[PDB]
DNA sequence: AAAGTACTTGAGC
RNA sequence: UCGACCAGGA
DNA sequence: GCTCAAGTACTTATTCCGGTCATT
């Protein structure tokens, strides 16, 4: 209850069944391209890689799965803070506000607003929503690994 | 059906009818037979608008 | 004139396993006898090459590979030193140098392929 | 495959040749850290898959009534109370093996006649 | 007739036990696919038969 | 079938296997990437007599050949069952790849009666790994073993 | 690689007697004796001393049948080309080009192995009233009229379809039309305007003739 | 997360059955997949037994 | 209601 | 008596 | 900057035969 804000997360794997470079990208609301998860993790904190595996795969000895990670680890190597991140969700999609300071506050506004709404749109978790797409991609890998 | 165990390909599982309309259908058999029947009369309503265009 | 450099070379490895192969024949049912053995096959595996007027190599691996094996082409190898055509099993080469448990396996997956893309 | 990460930063780890003593390392792009590689496999494919089928095998596996029993004896307790199912590899392909699990030592076990496992 | 009426359920109990055996040997990895077709594609369609063998 | 092979039963089969596309990718069990530095010799203990027969004598040369390749390796494994199902050579899968890349791989392979069949592979005359990688997905999903492009399960009938 | 060899020179013989049945199909004195010759008959001819097929020795002239003279009075001689060069060359096509010319030929039918310069092609509708026609090897390995499928396709002479047109009472426009790129219009030579009369069986009256203008 | 699900699972399912969670509250534990998924949610479809 | 025409965009090279 | 929706019949 | 794969826009259907609403 509450205006019912229909927010359709999408979680793509990009590339088919033994196409060379598999990565995986993310659909947001109010944002026009699509965002490759590492980003997303980094936008909301968790910024080095198994950290982000972790909130991802849960078993360490599943190589299987983690391979098909490297890829996106590979992606999203370009940000590396998350400022780099947020600067990088704001400029892609509404967005055409230029000028640095305020593309990266209304980045902010959209990963507590629109993104995952069910949960909390309060400030302060980052966290839950952390591990939430993190369980969202490992569902989409469990399928892609036909498990 | 919830009627049934895991990873059960017997005949009653998978929807054989051994009874005859005579002797009458046990709920599972008469869920299958509903089930298969219903698959007929969506048939019948669909290739209707379908062959009908095709005879224009 | 660069033949016979590849020729030479490949008389070597027949002589290597005809040394190496020979133990079990005495140990159930030296140097110099598989040196002489070797060059009755570098020719006659020639003989099967340029017809009337490349594939040899590859026919000396096999040859070389089954030959060593053991404990069951050594029945096959036994035969081999033994009066069995050593002219038939140059121009032999397939899966009838294979192991009689190799096979077994081959034919049992033959047969059983034929009865599948029959219907 | 089973890779590592950098100690410092926690990042991926690429590899790197150390042309000078012909040696894999693995360095770290975030920073400055090196270590030498464990083995010398960086890459696995695997088109035929075996990981998937004994997925999902929790200690509470008995307590599912949806799963269905059977009289079996185990190999290693010899008990006659086990909670059965089917290869959890979710692929058209896959073969109607049932794996076992033991309601006593948690063994797995399968009616696999072809060939013999340890998962 | 009674007599026909006993025929007609061991009929259907001899294919079941036809199923059940296919059922045992597919179960033991020893059934083998019909070219282009599945394990299971296999085995589903001798079933499939051996049922519509005993309704007829 | 040919007028007078109507009824010639090893005809059929013939042709079924002649005509029945067939590709590196169906009888690959996996392909793993292995940093084996120098290429006249071998890290993996198990490939120990492939380097001990095909690449001893011959040489294709004396070595003259470039023995100065890539220390990166690209080794394929085999399945033995659907590569007698589909009737394969070892040296058949060997030529159709060195047909393939020419003369920038230098591939070589082990027996087709030993215990694993296995494919080694090695680049040919800065910056290599990501390459690799990219002509392992060509070999797999392009190069034809046997049969003709758009031809799936051939079934024969009487 | 013996068998590819053996395999190449097969497909050879066997486009060289569909070209020898497609002139002869055209009105062209050739002898069932010349296009059922035989493989062994062929390599003794046209392969040099290590067995490798010489294309160049391959190409041939044919004249038209004293009945063909008859019906097309206008109908002149023809050349066949096989080229070794499987890319055939822009330097190599003026050769046979000017082939035709000098010698006065009415058509000139050129065998290709994989391809020909788009340069070369060029030169093709370069030399009227000549006509220039390009063939590949492997589409000819296998005559297309020799099928269950294709029935017999005749060219009518000008006479042939200016009769056809008065007893069925029609404009070009009302008859059945056939593609100027259609295999059996390219195996007869079709120009556009030119009319087949197709005898085909019928479940219905034993035998029908249809008739299809070129275009 | 949960350290002990089928103590919790007979808890919430007595829970229930005494009336103290609302009857028509679903809740499901699939062991296979270590989940307990519940649903307060208005509009499911259910029948008793 | 999925599949066609007829353009136009991306980019292989 | 302008025509949209819904419900039906063979 | 040229061929060509591929993405885009935008097109197109589906037999015959009372009640209620709002508005014309
Ligand atoms: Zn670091
Ligand atoms: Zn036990």
């Known amino acids: 209850k509450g205006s019912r804000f229909i927010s359709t997360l999408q979680v793509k794997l990009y590339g088919r069944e033994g196409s060379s470079a598999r990565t995986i990208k993310a659909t947001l609301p109010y944002i026009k391209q699509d965002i490759p998860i590492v980003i997303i993790f980094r936008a909301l904190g968790i910024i080095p890689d198994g950290e982000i595996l972790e909130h991802i795969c849960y078993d360490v000895n599943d190589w299987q799965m983690l391979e098909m990670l490297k890829p996106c680890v590979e992606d999203g190597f370009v940000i590396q803070d998350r400022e780099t991140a947020l600067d990088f969700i704001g400029r892609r999609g509404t967005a055409l506000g230029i000028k640095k300071e305020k593309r990266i506050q209304y980045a902010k506004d959209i990963l507590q607003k629109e993104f995952l709404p069910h949960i909390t749109q309060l400030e302060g978790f980052e966290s839950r929503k952390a591990f939430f797409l993190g369980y969202m991609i490992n569902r989409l890998l469990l399928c892609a690994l036909d498990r | 059906l919830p009627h049934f165990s895991k990873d059960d390909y017997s005949p009653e599982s998978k929807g054989f009818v051994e009874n005859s309309y005579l002797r009458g259908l046990t709920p599972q058999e008469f869920f299958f037979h509903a089930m298969g029947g219903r698959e007929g009369l969506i048939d019948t309503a669909v290739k209707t608008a379908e062959t009908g265009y095709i005879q224009r | ?119 | 495959t089973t890779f590592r990460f950098c100690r410092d930063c926690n990042n991926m780890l690429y590899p790197r040749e150390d042309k000078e003593n012909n040696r894999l390392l693995f360095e770290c792009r975030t920073c400055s850290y090196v270590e030498e590689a464990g083995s010398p496999l960086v890459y696995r494919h695997e088109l035929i898959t075996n990981i998937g089928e004994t997925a999902g095998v929790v200690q509470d596996i008995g307590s599912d009534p949806t799963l269905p029993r059977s009289d079996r004896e185990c190999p290693k307790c010899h008990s006659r109370e086990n909670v059965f199912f089917q290869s959890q590899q979710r692929r058209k392909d896959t073969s109607m093996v049932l794996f076992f699990v033991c309601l006593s030592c948690s063994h797995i076990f399968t009616s696999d006649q072809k060939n013999k496992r340890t998962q | 007739d009674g007599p026909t009426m006993r025929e007609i359920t061991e009929t259907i109990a001899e294919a079941k036990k036809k199923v059940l055996d296919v059922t045992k040997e597919a179960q033991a990895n020893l059934l083998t696919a019909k070219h282009g077709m599945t394990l299971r594609e296999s085995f589903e369609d001798n079933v499939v038969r051996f049922l519509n063998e005993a309704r007829d | 079938l040919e007028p007078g092979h109507a009824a010639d039963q090893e005809q059929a089969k013939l042709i079924r296997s002649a005509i029945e596309h067939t590709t590196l990718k169906s009888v690959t069990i996996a392909s793993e990437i292995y940093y084996d530095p120098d290429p006249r010799s071998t890290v993996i203990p198990e490939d120990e007599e492939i380097i001990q027969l095909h690449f001893s004598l011959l040489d294709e040369e004396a070595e003259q050949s470039f023995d100065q390749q890539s220390p990166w390796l690209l080794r394929l494994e085999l399945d033995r069952a659907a590569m007698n199902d589909k009737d394969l050579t070892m040296g058949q899968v060997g030529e159709r790849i060195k047909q393939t890349f020419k003369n920038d791989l230098f591939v070589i392979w082990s027996e087709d009666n030993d215990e694993k069949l296995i494919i080694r592979c090695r680049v040919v005359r800065a910056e290599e790994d990501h390459m690799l990688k990219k002509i392992e997905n060509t070999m797999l999903e392009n190069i034809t073993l046997r049969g003709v492009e758009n031809i799936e399960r051939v079934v024969m009938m009487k | 690689m013996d068998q590819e060899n053996e395999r190449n020179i097969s497909r050879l013989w066997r486009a060289f007697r569909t070209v020898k049945e497609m002139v002869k199909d055209r009105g062209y004195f050739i002898t069932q004796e010349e296009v059922e010759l035989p493989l062994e008959d062929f390599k003794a001819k046209y392969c040099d001393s290590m067995g490798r097929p010489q294309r160049k020795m391959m190409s041939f002239q044919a004249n038209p049948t004293e009945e063909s003279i008859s019906k097309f009075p206008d109908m002149g001689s023809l050349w066949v080309e096989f080229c070794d060069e499987p890319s055939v060359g822009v330097k190599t096509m003026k050769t046979f080009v000017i082939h035709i010319q000098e010698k006065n030929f009415q058509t000139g039918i050129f065998v290709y192995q994989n391809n020909i310069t788009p340069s070369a092609m060029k030169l093709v509708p370069s030399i009227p009233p000549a006509t220039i026609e390009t063939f590949n090897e492997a589409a000819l390995v296998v005559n297309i009229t020799h099928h269950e499928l294709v029935p017999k396709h005749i060219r009518l002479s000008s006479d042939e379809k200016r009769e056809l047109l008065k007893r069925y009472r029609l404009k070009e426009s009302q008859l059945p039309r056939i593609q100027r790129a259609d295999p059996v219009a390219l195996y007869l030579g079709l120009k556009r305007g030119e009319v087949v009369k197709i005898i085909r069986k019928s479940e219905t009256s034993g035998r029908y003739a249809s008739y299809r203008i070129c275009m | 997360v949960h350290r002990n699900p089928a103590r919790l699972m007979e808890t919430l399912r007595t829970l229930r059955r005494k009336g103290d969670i609302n009857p028509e509250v679903s809740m499901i534990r699939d062991i296979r997949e270590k989940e307990l998924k519940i649903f307060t949610d208005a509009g499911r479809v259910y029948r008793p037994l």
Request: charged share 35%; proline share 3%; with cysteine.
């Open chain 3, 1 to 119: 004139e660069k033949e016979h450099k590849l020729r030479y070379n490949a008389e070597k490895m027949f002589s290597t396993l005809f040394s190496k192969f020979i133990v079990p024949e005495t140990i159930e049912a030296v140097i110099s006898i598989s040196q002489e053995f070797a060059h009755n096959l570098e020719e006659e595996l020639y003989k099967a090459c340029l017809n009337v007027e490349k594939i040899y190599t590859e026919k000396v691996r096999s040859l070389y590979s089954n030959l060593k094996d053991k404990k069951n082409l050594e029945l096959k190898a036994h035969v081999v030193e033994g009066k069995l055509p050593l002219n038939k099993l140059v121009n032999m080469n397939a899966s009838e140098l294979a192991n009689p448990d190799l096979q077994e396996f081959k034919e049992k997956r033959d047969k059983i392929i034929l009865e599948n893309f029959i219907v």
